[PDB]
Design a protein around this ligand. Structure first.
Ligand code: HEM
Ligand code: HEM
Ligand code: HEM
Ligand code: HEM
Lengths: 141, 143, 141, 146
């Protein structure tokens, strides 16, 4: 349920995010792991130390995924189909964690694009990330 | 509700570089905008019909001052959040009837605003510190 | 929204609820008001004393609405589309309250029809009520 | 948590009317069935492929007994849950990394199973009492540190 305005805010903000995708992805994960240590257990095979190459490569894939959701904002479910199956059947990630990652991304955005991160932008992104999180956990319902 | 001295510093420093009163008003406003149902407890404040309106509502900014002030108190007593907020807890519980889940939301709003003001200074490690603080404050309020 | 096995369980269980709809509706609300008093704030105009004709009447309407969703299960939103505005824009009910009411109804069903309340039937009703709840709160997310 | 000598007598009397072990086993079982992601914490329990396999799983049942035993401890110390579960709180957070929201979910499973077992005896008032208990246990388990 995204209004036309909210949708443009997501597209506009995405344009800027895509030019700093790699750093935004890495910072988001660092915030997640540090603020919510429980999330680290999903990456036992990962080098989660600062500047890590795995983390950096992974953070890039995550933001790219968010980008696909932007490109397919009208059918996020279809776009992220493969990922929802992976996170539910294979990774079995606790739904609460998606809310935690969403919060951390919002923090990264607010700190990186203060001028663009208004209340409305915030509401639009929270709503968008809620749909992305809902789609990724749909396999539990 | 423990904090490494290294962290104790971060929270002490960073909370200084920011304008507390603005944080509270903006955190409350974001709460009302991002979670429209929380508006139900503020019919008095007047016009909350839109974001810009909400963010510019005098009564909303004024209340944020008190919320941020209280938050600040618990910030000076991160070891006794229990009693510090005890009075407020029963006020939000028995009198205002606010579902405890909401306290956690405002805490997230505060965290986001801090990142909004401090920018690059609000680093991951710094956020973790404040999250623990925020988590503690909400816990006390619900407890 | 629901698979055939879930649909089958919802319908057969509803067959039983229908004959006791009024008492189930009333029992659910009373369990809710007592275990989660915060919810009472939404009914200041109500005489919340047991046996209340006002409370019982409201209970009948809630269960009636659940039944309407059961009847046209292939399109739950279309059967409850009306109730959305009321709860979301008018009543501004905190979404957490829907989990609470759903939980209370599950307790009522478990207590009333123990033989039918298997783990599978529980899973199906939980998913069904969650679908009903999203529709009623859809004007939020 | 704080319950009147009335609620405490009710909780006490009703609790004595159920097979605690079955309540714990069925509550855990329902948790695994209704919120499938919780299965991630019990890989060593074996076959959890279907609601049927879960509810009849011996390890699930065996573990439910341990859960309910600790739950029973709480029923015997409602004036001091924080302390009673401090050790379990540490295990689930520091060692198991279980998001505390799940403590609330299992608490809800127990309340539902109590209703399932007690029928008419699990009155709206009785549920309210047990609700305070289960909320107390969940909070005690989520309490950071002690
Ligand atoms: C906005 C939410 C999220 C998005 C868009 C997202 C996206 C992705 C993508 C694109 C992959 C890689 C798929 C592939 O290479 O086949 C992935 C992998 C993974 N994700 Fe997520 N994810 C999200 C949230 C989460 C959360 C909350 C967790 C748990 C804390 C999580 C844990 C994992 C794990 C463990 C992997 C496996 C990576 C590996 O083995 O290298 N994800 N995610
Ligand atoms: C970071 C968490 C929060 C803190 C520290 C906090 C603090 C306060 C304080 C200090 C007061 C003034 C009471 C007094 O001492 O005289 C207050 C009032 C109030 N709070 Fe909060 N609060 C928090 C979260 C919330 C949330 C989540 C809600 C629900 C949307 C809420 C709703 C209210 C209401 C309705 C009032 C009374 C306002 C009036 O009468 O105009 N608070 N709060
Ligand atoms: C499965 C979830 C629910 C269903 C199916 C449901 C259904 C209904 C229906 C059919 C009505 C009557 C509409 C009319 O008069 O035209 C109603 C009214 C109402 N509902 Fe709900 N409801 C649900 C959950 C809730 C929740 C969680 C709350 C808040 C704790 C709530 C609060 C109210 C209130 C305050 C009214 C006004 C009724 C009056 O003044 O008589 N409802 N609901
Ligand atoms: C009413 C809330 C709960 C209580 C009272 C409780 C109690 C216990 C107890 C007494 C143990 C055994 C400790 C020992 O003797 O070594 C245990 C173990 C465990 N619990 Fe919980 N628990 C609760 C909720 C949860 C939840 C929600 C989860 C995750 C979905 C969980 C996951 C585990 C795991 C993975 C173990 C270790 C089992 C093993 O290694 O085989 N518990 N719990």
């Amino acid at each position: 349920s995204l209004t036309k305005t909210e949708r443009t805010i997501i597209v506009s903000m995405w344009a800027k995010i895509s030019t700093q995708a790699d750093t935004i992805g890495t910072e988001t994960l660092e915030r997640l792991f540090l603020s919510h240590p429980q999330t680290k257990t999903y990456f036992p095979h990962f080098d989660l130390h600062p500047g890590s190459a795995q983390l950096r490569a992974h953070g890039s894939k995550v933001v790219a995924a968010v980008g696909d959701a932007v490109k397919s904002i009208d059918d996020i479910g279809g776009a992220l189909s493969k990922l929802s199956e992976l996170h539910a059947y294979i990774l079995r990630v606790d739904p609460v964690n998606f809310k935690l990652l969403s919060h951390c991304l919002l923090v990264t955005l607010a700190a990186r694009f203060p001028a663009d991160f208004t209340a409305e932008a915030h509401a639009a992104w929270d709503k968008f990330l809620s749909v992305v999180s809902s789609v990724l956990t749909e396999k539990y319902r | 509700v423990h904090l490494t001295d290294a962290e104790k510093a971060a929270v002490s420093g960073l909370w200084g570089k920011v304008n507390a009163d603005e944080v509270g008003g903006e955190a409350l406003g974001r709460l009302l905008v991002v979670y429209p149902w929380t508006q139900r407890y503020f019919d008095s404040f007047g016009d909350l019909s839109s974001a810009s309106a909400i963010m510019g509502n005098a009564k909303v900014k004024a209340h944020g001052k008190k919320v941020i002030t209280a938050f600040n108190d618990g910030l000076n007593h991160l070891d006794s959040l229990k009693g510090t907020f005890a009075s407020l807890s029963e006020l939000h519980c028995d009198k205002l009837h606010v579902d405890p889940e909401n306290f956690r939301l405002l805490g997230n709003m505060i965290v986001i605003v801090l990142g909004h003001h401090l920018g690059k200074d609000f680093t991951p490690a710094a956020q973790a510190a404040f999250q623990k603080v925020v988590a503690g404050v909400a816990a006390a309020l619900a407890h």
